[PDB]
Design a protein around this ligand. Structure first.
Ligand SMILES: Cc1cc2nc3c(=O)[nH]c(=O)nc-3n(C[C@H](O)[C@H](O)[C@H](O)COP(=O)(O)O)c2cc1C
Ligand code: SF4
Ligand code: SF4
Ligand code: SF4
Ligand code: SF4
Ligand code: FES
Ligand code: FES
Lengths: 59, 41, 66, 54, 425, 186, 230
């Protein structure tokens, strides 16, 4: 368990694992992670904008 | 007292026995007081 | 234009102060120098909501289907 | 972690099944703890000196 | 001091032959002209002096309960509600007191008409009873045509007419607010009892809800002597209550036995299954379904009374016997009773609609035995949480018997749990 | 299901009382005009007795005749157990399964009725004559088993006797208040 | 002149006759956790969460139901009142899906704020969880009835104030569905308020859907134009 590089995982059968809760945005102490949420026109609630700037973020 | 169940009248009853008696019980019945309104909702 | 965030030039914007009294908040605004437009506190009105009104006979306030 | 899940975030195997744990996981993030009002002071001995947290 | 065997002078007698003309020959409507002529102070005062306990599955005394619905001055006309629907499974008082002798219940509506000050009387029968409803309506048709109910009732100014209203297969006609709401037109859900009781709002009227067995005692106290119903039984509990012997028995029969009768002699008088309390594993219920199961150690010594049974941690209210055999499973039987409460819970209070329904799913695991030994100790706390915080008393009725699985039992529960866990794993 | 209302023709065909409409007026006459919505339960019971298996439009027509909102009438019908709205049957066989009957052998009567008729547990017969349902309690707990059919229930029935009553029901309806012993005590 | 002196935790407060226990507690500054009660809507004792124990009484009464009479010492922080709130909260969340990430309501949720403060830290729950088939009410209001706690507040809203009469309880026990039985497309005036009436994430705005969480958006007060009342 090591932290250094930000990468978002997905399910074994495709499909983006992230849900756009903005939970990770609120906990973020640097306020680095920016998130805009939208419905994907097919019921599921997922992401549109997802910028985690490395100018900020203290890992 | 006789050793026989005297409830044979209940066996010979059709689908319209409670609804048929209720229409028959219209005579000798006091009118119910309303005093409220024609339509509450 | 750098990315997607909404950046603002205005510095004094992202601050929320706390006050105990309306007279203290007005005095602090005059002390800072900035002009203030005070709004009156909208207190919730006491409405007599009784359970007995739900089962009314003369009144039309009778609740239908629970 | 602290036995009370009202302060310590619940375990990952525990939070994914029961409702109470996931709410506590949702509320210990975004919101803090809701701390009792007042002022505390601690100074645990540093090799350099004192970390006098106020 | 002790309870008399069956009693030769009993309140209920109609079982062999009675229709309409036979009621006058048996001993009904004899002093109806004298009782109606007497004032409300003489009618309600006689009921208060006798001290007749509540025949329904509540335990509340009738003497104080009828006094609230006296009504000195009111705008809305007062009504009388008689809940004749069948209560807890085991209690068969509704099928016997209505189908065999309907005029005994009809006499209570006339006796309680001038006493409570009712303009109109309602007799609420369950939807399952249609053969009983046909007999009840025909007796009401003979009563109205004769000239004893409606306009001029036994030579009195008070005019009260009885009307039969059929339900639709619902257990939620039990509570006083529940039976009132069911006749009101809205869904069968009970109103909040603390702010507006029965005497405050029932079909937009100050009314009083009473059981069919409790309504049958009113002409028995009026026509016959008040001391006759008061002396038989105990000091606190008074009046002959019909206790139906059912369950695992060779000859199941409903008997009109006197109050404060011993349970060992009650099974012997009706002829039980294996034994009165020796051969078969005694787990007999003192009530219909609401009361917790009584152990083999405390059964012969305990008496079936309205007040005395509650002191022995098994409050009998529904007044019915449900005996269990040694061969039959104790855990599987009560789990079906909880499943009965799952189907018959109305769905208002969240500790009942999401409580009892959750209680049944945990209890289903106990039958198969796929539960931890700690789960027995936990379930006792959940049952305590349900009992205190509900609108109606169905939340109580689904909490008492499951507590009876914790008390006196538990070696029966642990042996079912340990053997099934070892076999599967 | 107790919420889903499909459009497989229960919304358009409607049923009305031709001569029983006068009986419905007498049923509304029993309860006072002040809050006249009390007649919603006995009128629906008369509608279900006139025609078994209640459609959506009949509930709307009962609400229109009683001047009540259609949502209040639909919620009342869905709440009670006695009303049949999803399956259709000539004689709905409802057997008791509660503990006062289960301890005195009710599962033996339930297994014998399932084998003889053809129904599994809740599904209706392909001939559309019998519909099996696990009822909570019939009322009369004095008899050890209890089974209800259409209007009258058969008390104290042996596994062979209950099968004989089901076989006879196909040709001629038998009354039978208790085909075992006396009505009062044994 | 029509005033009753009563005690909230032993503190004197003067109230009008006819007022509820919760109304008396609002006067001193106390706020009992609630789900059915609303300032504008009627009174129903459905959820039984607003339980508050008054001394010298065997059973705990709800703040919704009881009107305040003479001489009551309402104890908010007693041993039984805390156990009552912790109990019912476990019942409310036993049959409620793990949907907080996919839920349209975030920090604004009434179940979240109350269960953290008043409810227990951990649940005894092992097996169960009911699932409810969702009904398409309208294009303006998204409806996921799985999350509904059957509180009966929207049903009272549509009947007493909106005056449309479409929502209603159907079934008994766990199997109780809130909504229209006939699958009717519910569209009327004040229908954009039923999303705010519902304390949980059962009723939500379909045009808004998913954009921001309550804590993320900065609130600003304004008078609404294109309306007569303003
Ligand atoms: C689970 C349960 C079921 C009940 N069922 C009935 C019933 O079917 N009929 C009835 O008259 N009373 C029933 N009662 C008793 C009620 O409390 C009733 O409204 C009232 O107290 C009867 O008053 P009485 O005993 O003075 O006649 C039931 C009580 C409980 C707890
Ligand atoms: S928004 Fe953040 S917390 Fe939510 S799923 Fe995506 S990465 Fe995880
Ligand atoms: S205790 Fe259960 S049955 Fe009684 S009112 Fe509450 S939810 Fe309904
Ligand atoms: S209603 Fe509240 S507790 Fe339930 S899933 Fe939504 S946010 Fe979570
Ligand atoms: S949808 Fe919301 S307001 Fe309506 S009953 Fe359910 S929880 Fe209450
Ligand atoms: S329990 Fe079977 S008839 Fe009542
Ligand atoms: S908020 Fe008072 S009972 Fe639900």
């Amino acid at each position: 368990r090591f932290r250094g590089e930000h990468a978002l995982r997905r399910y074994p059968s495709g499909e983006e694992r992230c849900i756009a809760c903005k939970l990770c945005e609120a906990v973020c102490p640097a306020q680095a992670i920016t998130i805009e949420a939208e419905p994907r026109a097919d019921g599921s609630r997922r992401t549109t904008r997802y910028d985690i700037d490395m100018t900020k973020c203290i890992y | 007292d006789n050793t026989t169940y005297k409830n044979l009248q209940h066996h010979d009853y059709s689908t319209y026995t409670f609804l048929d008696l209720n229409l028959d019980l219209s005579k000798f019945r006091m009118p119910q007081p309303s005093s409220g309104r024609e339509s509450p909702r | 234009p750098l990315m997607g965030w909404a950046s603002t030039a205005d510095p004094l914007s992202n601050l929320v102060l706390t006050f105990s009294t309306k007279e203290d908040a007005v005095a602090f605004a005059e002390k800072n120098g900035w002009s203030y437009d005070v709004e009156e506190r909208k207190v919730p009105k006491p409405k007599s909501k009784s359970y007995g009104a739900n089962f009314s006979w003369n009144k039309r306030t009778r609740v239908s289907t629970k | 972690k602290v036995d009370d899940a009202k302060v310590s975030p619940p375990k990952r195997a525990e939070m994914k099944t029961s409702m109470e744990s996931l709410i506590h996981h949702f509320k210990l993030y975004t919101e803090g703890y809701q701390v009792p009002p007042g002022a505390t002071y601690t100074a645990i001995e540093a090799p350099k000196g004192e970390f006098g947290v106020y | 001091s002790l309870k008399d065997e069956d009693r030769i002078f009993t309140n209920l007698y109609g079982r062999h032959d009675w229709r309409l003309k036979g009621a006058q020959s048996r001993g009904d409507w004899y002093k109806t002209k004298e009782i109606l002529l007497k004032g409300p102070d003489w009618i309600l005062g006689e009921v208060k002096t006798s001290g007749l306990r509540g025949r329904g599955g509540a335990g509340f005394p009738t003497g104080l309960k009828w006094s609230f619905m006296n009504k000195p001055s009111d705008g809305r006309p007062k009504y009388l509600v008689v809940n004749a629907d069948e209560g807890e499974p085991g209690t068969c008082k509704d099928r016997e007191i209505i189908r065999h002798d309907p005029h005994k219940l009809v006499e209570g509506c006339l006796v309680g008409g001038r006493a409570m000050g009712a303009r109109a009387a309602y007799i609420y029968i369950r939807g399952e009873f249609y053969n009983e409803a046909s007999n009840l309506q025909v007796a009401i048709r003979e009563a109205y045509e004769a000239g004893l109910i409606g306009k001029n009732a036994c030579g009195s100014g008070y005019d009260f007419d009885v009307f039969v209203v059929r339900g639709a297969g619902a257990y939620i006609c039990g509570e006083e607010t529940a039976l009132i709401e069911s006749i009101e037109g809205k869904q069968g859900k009970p109103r909040l009892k603390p702010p507006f009781p029965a005497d405050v709002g029932v079909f937009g009227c100050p009314t009083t809800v009473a059981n069919v067995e409790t309504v049958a005692v009113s002409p028995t106290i009026c026509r016959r002597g008040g001391a006759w119903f008061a002396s038989f039984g105990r000091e606190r509990n008074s009046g002959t209550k019909l206790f139906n012997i059912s369950g695992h028995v060779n000859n199941p029969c409903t008997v009109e036995e006197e109050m404060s009768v011993p349970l060992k002699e009650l099974i012997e008088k009706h002829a039980g299954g294996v034994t009165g309390g020796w051969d078969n594993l005694l787990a007999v219920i003192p009530g219909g379904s609401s009361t917790p199961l009584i152990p083999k150690s405390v059964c012969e010594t305990v008496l079936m009374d309205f007040d005395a049974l509650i002191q022995a941690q098994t409050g009998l209210g529904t007044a019915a016997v449900i005996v269990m055999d040694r061969s039959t499973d104790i855990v599987k039987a009560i789990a079906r009773l909880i499943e009965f409460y799952k189907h018959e819970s109305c769905g208002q209070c969240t500790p009942c609609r999401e409580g009892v329904d959750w209680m049944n799913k945990v209890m289903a695991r106990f039958v198969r035995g796929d539960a931890r030994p700690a789960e027995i100790d936990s379930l006792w706390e959940i049952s305590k949480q349900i009992e205190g915080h509900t609108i109606c008393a169905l939340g109580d009725g689904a909490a008492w018997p499951v507590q009876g699985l914790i008390r006196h039992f538990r070696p029966e529960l642990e042996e079912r749990m340990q053997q099934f866990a070892q076999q599967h794993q | 299901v107790h919420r889903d209302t499909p459009e497989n023709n229960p919304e358009t065909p409607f049923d009305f009382t031709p001569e029983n409409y006068k009986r419905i007026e007498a049923i509304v006459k029993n309860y006072p005009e002040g809050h006249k919505a009390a007649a919603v339960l006995p009128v629906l019971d008369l509608a279900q007795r006139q025609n078994g298996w209640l459609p959506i439009s009949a509930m709307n027509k009962v609400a229109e005749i009683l001047q009540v909102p259609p949502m209040r009438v639909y919620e009342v019908a869905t709440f009670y157990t006695m009303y049949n709205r999803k399956p259709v049957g000539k004689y709905h066989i409802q057997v008791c399964t509660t503990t006062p009957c289960m301890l005195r052998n009710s599962d033996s009567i339930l297994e014998a009725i399932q084998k003889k008729l053809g129904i599994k547990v809740g599904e209706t017969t392909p001939d559309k004559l019998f519909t099996l349902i696990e009822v909570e309690c019939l009322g009369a707990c004095v008899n050890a088993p209890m089974v209800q059919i259409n209007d009258n229930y058969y008390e104290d029935l042996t596994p062979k006797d209950i099968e004989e009553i089901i076989d006879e029901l196909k040709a001629g309806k038998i009354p039978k208040p208790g085909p075992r012993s006396g009505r009062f005590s044994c | 002149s029509n005033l009753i002196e009563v005690f909230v935790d032993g503190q004197s407060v003067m109230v009008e006759p006819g007022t509820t226990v919760l109304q008396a507690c609002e006067k001193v500054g106390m706020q009992i956790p609630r789900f059915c009660y609303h300032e504008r809507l009627s009174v129903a004792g459905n959820c039984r969460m607003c339980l508050v124990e008054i001394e010298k009484a065997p059973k705990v009464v709800a703040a919704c139901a009881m009107p305040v009479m003479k001489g009551w010492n309402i104890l908010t922080n007693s041993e039984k009142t805390k156990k009552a709130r912790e109990g019912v909260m476990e019942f409310l969340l036993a049959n409620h899906p793990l949907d907080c990430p996919i839920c349209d309501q975030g920090g604004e949720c009434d179940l979240q704020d109350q269960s953290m403060m008043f409810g227990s830290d951990r649940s005894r729950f092992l097996e169960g969880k009911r699932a409810v088939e969702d009904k398409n009410i309208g294009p303006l209001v998204k409806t996921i009835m799985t999350r509904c706690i059957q509180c009966t507040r929207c049903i009272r809203f549509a009947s007493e104030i909106a005056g449309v009469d479409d929502l209603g309880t159907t079934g008994r026990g766990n199997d109780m569905q809130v909504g229209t039985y006939i699958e009717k497309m519910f569209m009327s005036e004040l229908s954009g308020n039923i999303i705010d009436i519902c304390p949980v994430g059962a009723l939500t705005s379909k045009p808004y859907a998913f954009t921001a969480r309550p804590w993320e958006t900065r609130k600003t007060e304004s008078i609404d134009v294109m309306d007569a009342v303003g």
